[PDB]
Design a protein around this ligand. Structure first.
Ligand SMILES: *C(=O)[C@H](C[C@@H]1CCNC1=O)NC(=O)[C@H](CC1CCCCC1)NC(=O)c1cc2ccccc2[nH]1
Ligand SMILES: O=C[C@H](C[C@@H]1CCNC1=O)NC(=O)[C@H](CC1CCCCC1)NC(=O)c1cc2ccccc2[nH]1
Length: 162
């Protein structure tokens, strides 16, 4: 992925989030800092925050990332698609991970209702990785399909919009 794509991934609370477009930031719900007063310098009351299970959209009142184009956001990928989980680490290291996406489902994880799509990793994910995006290339378009929310020892769970 080009630097433009990686630059959309930004640390956010205990994990990460992803700029889909100049005004739209997505992340995993459980990652969002509680009792934060502002995100990216914007008071929280001015942000439109919509949670769909563990998929969270934050829509800012003015464009924040005017440098980025709006990317296609879809609810998961067709079954069998090998997506890339774009992991950033706090050291700065980039760790793209290939994951074959499987069935869509809604299930409880540690008592929380999670709608998303499970994948299988093809050197793994760690507790600080949630909120990183799943993307794949469809023709000449990059498509973002969800955010990293959970993993087991090679199942990964991509939370998707409802
Ligand atoms: C991000 O916060 C982490 C990333 C995981 C940690 C371990 N490897 C990863 O990729 N996410 C979690 O730890 C989730 C937290 C849940 C909180 C409530 C909302 C849904 C996510 N939990 C797990 O990843 C998890 C729970 C669990 C239980 C039993 C077996 C495996 C297992 N994995
Ligand atoms: N069934 C189970 O016990 C496992 C346990 C699961 C493994 C991955 C990390 C979190 C816990 N759950 C799963 O496979 C699962 C798939 C899935 C798809 C969408 C939403 C939630 C989901 N959960």
């Amino acid at each position: 992925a080009p630097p433009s794509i990686w630059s959309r991934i930004v640390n956010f609370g205990s994990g990460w989030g992803f700029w889909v477009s100049p005004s739209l930031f997505i992340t995993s719900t459980h990652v969002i800092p509680q009792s934060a007063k502002e995100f990216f310098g914007v008071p929280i009351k001015q942000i439109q925050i919509h949670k769909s299970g563990e998929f969270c959209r934050l829509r800012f009142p003015k464009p924040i990332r005017t440098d980025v184009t709006g990317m296609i956001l879809e609810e998961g990928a067709p079954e069998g698609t090998v997506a890339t989980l774009l992991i950033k680490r706090p050291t700065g290291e980039l760790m793209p991970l290939a994951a074959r996406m499987g069935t869509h489902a809604t299930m409880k994880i540690q008592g929380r209702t999670v709608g998303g799509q499970m994948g299988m990793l093809l050197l793994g994910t760690t507790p600080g990785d949630c909120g990183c995006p799943y993307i794949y290339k469809r023709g000449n378009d990059y498509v973002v399909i969800g955010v990293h929310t959970a993993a087991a020892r090679n199942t990964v769970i991509c939370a998707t919009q409802g």
